[PDB]
Amino acid sequence: EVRVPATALCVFDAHDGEVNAVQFSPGSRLLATGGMDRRVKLWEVFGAACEFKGSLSGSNAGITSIEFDSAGSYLLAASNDFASRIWTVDDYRLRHTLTGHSGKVLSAKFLLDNARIVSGSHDRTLKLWDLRSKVCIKTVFAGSSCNDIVCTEQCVMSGHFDKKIRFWDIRSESIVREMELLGKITALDLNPERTELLSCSRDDLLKVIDLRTNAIKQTFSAPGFKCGSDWTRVVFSPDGSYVAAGSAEGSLYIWSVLTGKVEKVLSKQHSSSINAVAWSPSGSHVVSVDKGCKAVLWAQP
């Protein structure tokens, strides 16, 4: 399976200021970080080391989300400058700027058809983009400022300021369900099987939603776990067995999805609030990035 990390193996200053986004490449060889300093930075991940490779430039405001495509060839980043951008990873080249939103873009994701992008914005819309034709396909009023989006082959799920998760049927391009939670939605993540939806909300609760029944399977909480950001990001481990979230006090919480219990509280490496976490697809590392420039790679020594 995957093993819960135990100790910090690498600590480094990744951005000039706040780090908002972090993701591993599908092959676990690259780490991408995204900051308020407007750069996506790529880092080569070694078993126990991490070194700077280069930057993906073009954004005029902070980076809010990062996603690799399934091939690991392309990287998609939303920005506070109202655009999303796509670069080819291997040559650092900007390939697309997606302009259209009239407010900060808080999330952008590849649909599972290798063709299209969905983005969600503080302008209270989702936009669907065709990358081949270089156009916005469709703009939909989403009821409330959108803080995160995730995609299955059937459904787009978006999380919002108004505490709702909205479920959009891809085939009928329409809303088919909404679930209301008890705090602003800060993040969403799907498990590897895309059968369960993980949410984080500003009531300081993580929830796992069974996508078959649209019911709450499990919650995760802890006395010291508090969101530090309206965009505190949380993730499943690559086997779906654990969930990870960074806290406002700088600790990385890991819970067991089966038992519901806290497995680890990884502390004493962040002096500021953790904004995002990522779990490498190989299980080699868990990374946390904070408001004070820092990335921490946690692993089993």
Swiss-Prot record:
Proteolytic cleavage by activated CASP3 leads to degradation and may regulate autophagy upon cellular stress and apoptotic stimuli. It is found in: Cytoplasm; Preautophagosomal structure membrane; Endosome membrane; Lysosome membrane. WD repeats lie at residues 14-53, 58-97, 100-139, 141-178, 180-219, 226-267, 269-301. Changing V234A: Impairs interaction with PPP1CA. Homodimer. Homooligomer. Heterooligomer with ATG16L2. Interacts with WIPI1. Interacts with WIPI2. Interacts with RB1CC1; the interaction is required for ULK1 complex-dependent autophagy. Interacts with ATG5. Part of the minor complex composed of 4 sets of ATG12-ATG5 and ATG16L1 (400 kDa); this complex interacts with ATG3 leading to disruption of ATG7 interaction and promotion of ATG8-like proteins lipidation. Part of the major complex composed of 8 sets of ATG12-ATG5 and ATG16L1 (800 kDa). Belongs to the WD repeat ATG16 family. Plays an essential role in both canonical and non-canonical autophagy: interacts with ATG12-ATG5 to mediate the lipidation to ATG8 family proteins (MAP1LC3A, MAP1LC3B, MAP1LC3C, GABARAPL1, GABARAPL2 and GABARAP). Acts as a molecular hub, coordinating autophagy pathways via distinct domains that support either canonical or non-canonical signaling. During canonical autophagy, interacts with ATG12-ATG5 to mediate the conjugation of phosphatidylethanolamine (PE) to ATG8 proteins, to produce a membrane-bound activated form of ATG8. The WD repeats are required for non-canonical autophagy but not for canonical autophagy. The WD repeats are required for the recruitment of LRRK2 to stressed lysosomes. It is linked to Inflammatory bowel disease 10: A chronic, relapsing inflammation of the gastrointestinal tract with a complex etiology. It is subdivided into Crohn disease and ulcerative colitis phenotypes. Crohn disease may affect any part of the gastrointestinal tract from the mouth to the anus, but most frequently it involves the terminal ileum and colon. Bowel inflammation is transmural and discontinuous; it may contain granulomas or be associated with intestinal or perianal fistulas. This is Autophagy-related protein 16-1. The gene is ATG16L1.
